[PDB]
Ligand binder design. Structure first.
Ligand SMILES: Nc1ncnc2c1ncn2[C@@H]1O[C@H](COP(=O)(O)OP(=O)(O)O)[C@@H](O)[C@H]1O
Lengths: 103, 102, 116
């Protein structure tokens, strides 16, 4: 099928709630990085990047969950990007496609 | 039309000048990460990521190259990656409307 | 031809071996970052005094390499061979399309830009 990477750049204090909400909905595989982005308004400030690769059919749901749980109503809540992924491979089994996501 | 992610891996001492040049040209939304590349083998680099309208890619690339170059090996590389969707977290706005920074 | 980004999220203790193997096969241009990950099931379970506690996010390393499409299979083989342990949490590889590669110094593009 089609696989997509959902990248969200959010406030660092929102990581725990967002990751919990994602986990509760069955999205447990995620990668988390520390990054910097512009402040609201000159130094950049800390943000968190969450990356999740999912089935294309799950993108809307993932985006809804992230938006609901990451938002505060103030400028600087962040942005989400969807990027095509053409191949996914599990390291330990060399499995590919959606199989590589599960277990 | 479409959106693209422009990723540049550059020298850490070039971050300020690049960021200022991009800002002056109206590109204020960028994400910065501390990474390592070549090259004790791996040395510190900075990854800049900006998602822009397709029409702005050439201009962004020009600005980054102009301001990040030194003429020595290790100046870095720029990748352009397709972005199929952009969503503003607070408002749930999408596409070009989501790209405006406030 | 086309360029592809190979991203691998692996165990931090596998970075040196993977990087060496990649280098020996001619892939020297790579970017490495420190990230945190969690896998599908459980999360790691450690013990304090008599009881267990869970650490959800644990340190991983992200390697990113942009290569000619023709080299993807080989990159993936090398990473898997050298990053695997047989235990859950070995990691994942994603292949992402790259539409343009530009060398900052020269503004060369394409295969010219990957040659280091
Ligand atoms: N769907 C996903 N999206 C993004 N990153 C993921 C995803 N699933 C797993 N990862 C990353 O890969 C690492 C290993 O995942 P895990 O499922 O534990 O590996 P394995 O497939 O070997 O069991 C995690 O620590 C995380 O960084």
């Amino acid at each position: 099928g089609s696989m997509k990477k959902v990248e969200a750049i959010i406030r660092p204090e929102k990581l725990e709630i967002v990751k919990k909400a994602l986990s509760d909905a069955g999205y447990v595989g995620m990668t988390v990085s520390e990054v910097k982005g512009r402040g609201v308004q000159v130094d950049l400030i800390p943000k968190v990047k969450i990356e999740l690769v999912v089935k294309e059919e799950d993108v809307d749901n993932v985006i809804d969950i992230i938006c609901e749980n990451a938002r505060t109503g103030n400028p600087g809540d962040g942005k989400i990007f969807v990027i095509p992924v053409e191949r996914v491979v599990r390291v330990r089994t060399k499995e590919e496609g959606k199989e590589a996501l599960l277990e």
